[PDB]
A paper describes a structure:
Here, we report the cryo-EM structures of a [name] nuclease (747 amino acids in length) in multiple functional states, revealing a stepwise process of DNA targeting involving a conformational switch in a REC2 domain insertion. To cleave a specific site in dsDNA, Type II CRISPR-Cas nucleases associate with a single guide RNA ([name]), a chimeric CRISPR RNA (crRNA)-trans-activating crRNA (tracrRNA), targeting a region complementary to the first 18-24 nucleotides of the 5ʹ end of the [name], termed the spacer. These nucleases cleave the target and non-target strands using the HNH and RuvC endonuclease domains, respectively. We show that [name] contains an intricately folded [name] that acts as a structural scaffold to anchor flexibly tethered protein domains. Structural comparison of [name] with other Cas9 nucleases and the ancestral IscB reveals a common ribonucleoprotein core furnished with increasingly large protein regulatory domains, which were acquired during evolutionary specialization.
Author numbering: 44 to 103, 134 to 186, 190 to 270, 549 to 743
RNA sequence: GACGCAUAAAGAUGAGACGCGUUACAGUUAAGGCUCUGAAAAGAGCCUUAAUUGUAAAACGCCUAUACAGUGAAGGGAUAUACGCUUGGGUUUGUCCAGCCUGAGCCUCUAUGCCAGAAAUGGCGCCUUCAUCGUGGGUUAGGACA
DNA sequence: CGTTTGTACTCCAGCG
DNA sequence: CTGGAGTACAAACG
DNA sequence: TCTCATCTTTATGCGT
């Protein structure tokens, strides 16, 4: 669930960024900085990289103080007033989704009929310790009051030197009194002492004039796969770079090897990225959502076998209903009427054979395994010759 | 031994951000190629590759306008609010979940931030209503039986 | 003899 | 890892 | 990468 959490975080971060840009745009247009002005362009471009602020910046990505200093420069040269600068800076520092962590995960008492955080019941946790000391109850209460009061620590040290308590007990007392007690207690206050689901791939591909391609950095192009590089000059340069540093097969050059091979360096000090042809894909796996073209591995949901007016079987792949509007290529246009439908992992048999197979990968001629007696080998049979068991 | 407490390490789950990468469109720069013009140097157009700048997209969908957000005013602010309790709802489907979001009523449990102040306290964040201005918001890349 | 299914083989997938 | 993709060669239906 | 919160398991003590 870690990767789904990361995708969810990327999605929500982008949504928050759309929220921040809209509010800034509305406010700047409300002042008089319409989108043609230089102040709108500068302040709006700075909002795409508003910086971090989780750590403090020393005295006089980027930190948010650097970004806000640039925003201050942009608005002062744009003749803005201090209230408008303050409101724009308020938009830069605004929190759009509420960060809620104080009371989220709750623990229930183990007794047969919510438990507090440990940091809120330090008195009870100290009372759990000092209740077993041999001294009287008035001294127990005085010790409990002295431990929790941060000024009376010397009295506690005097008590422990007097009564010769164990070092681990003194340790426990000071960690209950002082430390940041993360978590909740086992008991309440009355009882302390008593495969996959992704429709498409994450990186969009470029699909122009029938050619599927994408950009990869020079340090991401494996040695045996150099021929996918579209640029002739950089393909031969990368071939000579692989020949120079004795990369046999598999993984690529490192950062230092790529820089020493003479490749250009980008402004963020990464290596240049090359346009490469994408293998292992086809035009039938291409979907377009907004501007982006993606590969989908869930493009087929089943196989439909049709009987025409001549009584002859023909197989057509049933495409995914969730993606049918987004396929670039036209859908199947079957003649006649449907006879039967073959889903993935259905058990089938082959015309003229007695063995029982099951569909591993599907299509017009789906790929079938033997259920019993398969050595891991498979074979493809036309779906017109199959029938469901 | 069991249980509780404290410490430490590792892992998991949820939340919120900062960046890199990818893609689409537009601009700029460099290198190369093709074509036209010219007495020639070279001028111009198109294409490719790389770098660079800006803007936009990153589930499909479903639900929500009886919603969501901004601004201003007024009132409340521990005798309070909700991340809590009780009971519903959206995602949600063929059925059931998780996770997240959320309505109404409520304060038994749980939680309650930032700043100035030794402190009482105050001011913001927060809650409600009204006015005004807009069109926005939640959840979806995870499971189980079908 | 000319299409048309059918093996053999190789390649594909976001991350600090 | 699944659930495909393309390509080369080939053996089989019409 | 960073921040915030909780949970589980494994030790090592202490207490009943």
């Amino acid at each position: 669930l870690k990767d789904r959490r990361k995708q969810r975080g990327i999605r929500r971060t982008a949504q928050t960024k759309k929220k921040r840009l809209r509010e800034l745009k509305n406010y700047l247009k409300s002042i008089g900085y319409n989108e043609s002005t230089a102040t709108f362009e500068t302040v709006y471009s700075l909002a795409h990289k508003r910086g971090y602020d989780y750590a403090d910046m020393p005295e006089e990505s980027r930190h948010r103080k650097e970004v806000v200093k640039d925003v201050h420069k942009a608005m002062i040269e744009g003749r803005a007033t201090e209230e408008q600068i303050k409101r724009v800076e308020r938009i830069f520092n605004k929190q759009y989704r509420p960060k809620r962590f104080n009371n989220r995960i709750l623990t229930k008492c183990k007794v047969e009929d919510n438990t507090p955080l440990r940091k809120n019941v330090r008195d009870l946790l100290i009372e759990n310790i000092v209740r077993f000391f041999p001294i009287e109850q008035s001294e127990k209460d005085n010790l409990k009051d002295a431990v929790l009061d941060k000024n009376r620590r010397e009295e506690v040290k005097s008590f422990f030197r007097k009564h010769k308590t164990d070092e681990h007990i003194r340790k426990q007392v000071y960690d209950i009194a002082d430390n940041k007690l993360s978590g909740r207690t086992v008991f309440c206050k009355e009882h302390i002492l008593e495969r996959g689901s992704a429709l498409h791939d994450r990186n969009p591909l470029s699909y122009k004039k029938g050619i599927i391609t994408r950009r990869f950095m020079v340090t991401e192009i494996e040695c045996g796969k150099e021929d996918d590089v579209i640029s002739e000059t950089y393909r031969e340069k990368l071939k000579e770079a692989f020949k120079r540093f004795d990369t046999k097969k598999g993984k690529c050059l490192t950062d230092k090897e790529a820089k020493e091979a003479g490749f250009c360096i980008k402004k963020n000090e990464l290596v240049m990225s090359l346009k490469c042809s994408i293998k292992g894909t086809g035009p039938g796996q291409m979907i377009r959502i907004n501007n982006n073209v993606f590969k989908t591995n869930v493009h087929n949901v089943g196989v439909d076998v049709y009987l025409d007016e001549k009584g002859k079987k023909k197989a057509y792949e049933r495409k995914n209903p969730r993606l049918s509007k987004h396929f670039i290529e036209p859908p199947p246009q079957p003649n006649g009427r449907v006879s039967f439908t073959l889903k993935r992992r259905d058990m089938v048999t082959v015309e003229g054979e007695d063995a029982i197979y099951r569909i591993k990968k599907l299509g017009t001629s789906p790929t079938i395994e033997a259920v019993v007696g398969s050595d891991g080998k498979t074979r493809t049979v036309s779906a017109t010759k199959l029938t469901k068991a």
